[PDB]
């Protein structure tokens, strides 16, 4: 199957409160496996999955040192961007980065990412050709021209096609066994009389992982694209997720409806009636 290794970088300034706050977070196939946070007590790269604890002390100190230098570099980027945009020096600002790669089953790279955001908005991104940049505005075009002169795209493409996927192959060999973890949903339906004429049939799905799931209500064969309400699936707090979906139905006519629960840890989708 396709796999990914990506890093989510945050730097946010605190005018007057000292050095800015700096974070690196690593994901393998969307699950957090390493974390560095400059506001922990002894900033260090830390394991965030217990399979990552195979890696030796040289790994951790190599990555800690790299993070410290990345951190030193984002404090300049913050001061640089204020000037490019000519903004007041009083305010808090953010830089965010998404960097990594998505690889196919042959282990070759499918998707490479190098994308920047300033104050929640796009700033510059490495295009999919892995040779050119998209700047979002005039400030970002300053960065673009300079990264063209540096051969920054070529530096990135070498990283993304090589280093990045090699490291991922090394991480999959360690936490593959863990990453395939699937928990099946546990579903049930709850009943709520609504004044005066209405019942609310709520379909719950709980204990499931991963969080990708689909819930539908059907009125004798059809799918109810309306009247149906739906919560963004939510972490329960223990590594499993939650979702519910419901709808309001007239009275004594709650035999006509059926919930269906679509999840990869189900051999067959679930069908539930009240």
């Amino acid at each position: 199957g396709p796999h990914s290794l990506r890093y989510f970088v945050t730097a946010v300034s605190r005018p007057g409160l000292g050095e800015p706050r700096y974070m690196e977070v690593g994901y393998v196939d969307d699950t957090e496996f390493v974390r560095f946070d400059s506001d922990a007590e002894n900033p260090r790269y830390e394991p965030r999955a217990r399979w990552m604890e195979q890696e030796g002390p040289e790994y951790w100190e190599r990555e800690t040192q790299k993070a410290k230098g990345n951190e030193q570099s984002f404090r300049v980027d913050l001061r640089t961007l204020l000037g490019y945009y000519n903004q007041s020096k009083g305010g808090s600002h953010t830089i965010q980065v998404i960097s990594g790669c998505e690889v196919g089953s042959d282990g070759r790279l499918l998707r490479g990412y190098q994308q920047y955001a300033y104050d929640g908005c796009d700033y510059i991104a490495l295009n999919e050709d892995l040779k050119t940049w998209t700047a979002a505005d005039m400030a970002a075009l300053i960065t673009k021209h300079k990264w063209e002169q540096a051969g920054e795209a070529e530096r990135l493409r070498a990283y993304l096609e090589g280093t990045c996927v090699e490291w991922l192959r090394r991480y999959l060999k360690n936490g593959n066994a863990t990453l395939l973890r699937t928990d099946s949903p546990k579903a049930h339906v709850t009943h709520h009389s609504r004044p005066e004429d209405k019942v609310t049939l709520r379909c719950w799905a709980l204990g499931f992982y991963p969080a990708d799931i689909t819930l539908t209500w059907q009125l004798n064969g059809e799918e109810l694209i309306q009247d149906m309400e739906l919560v963004e699936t939510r972490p329960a707090g223990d590594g499993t997720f939650q979702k519910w979906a419901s709808v309001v139905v007239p009275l004594g006519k709650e035999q006509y409806y059926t919930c269906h629960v679509y999840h990869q840890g189900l051999p067959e989708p679930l069908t539930l009636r009240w």
Binding site: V9, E24, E63, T80
Partner: peptide, 8 residues
């Protein structure tokens, strides 16, 4: 392993 980043 994350890349060393360059300046904006």
């Amino acid at each position: 392993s994350i890349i060393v980043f360059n300046l904006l």
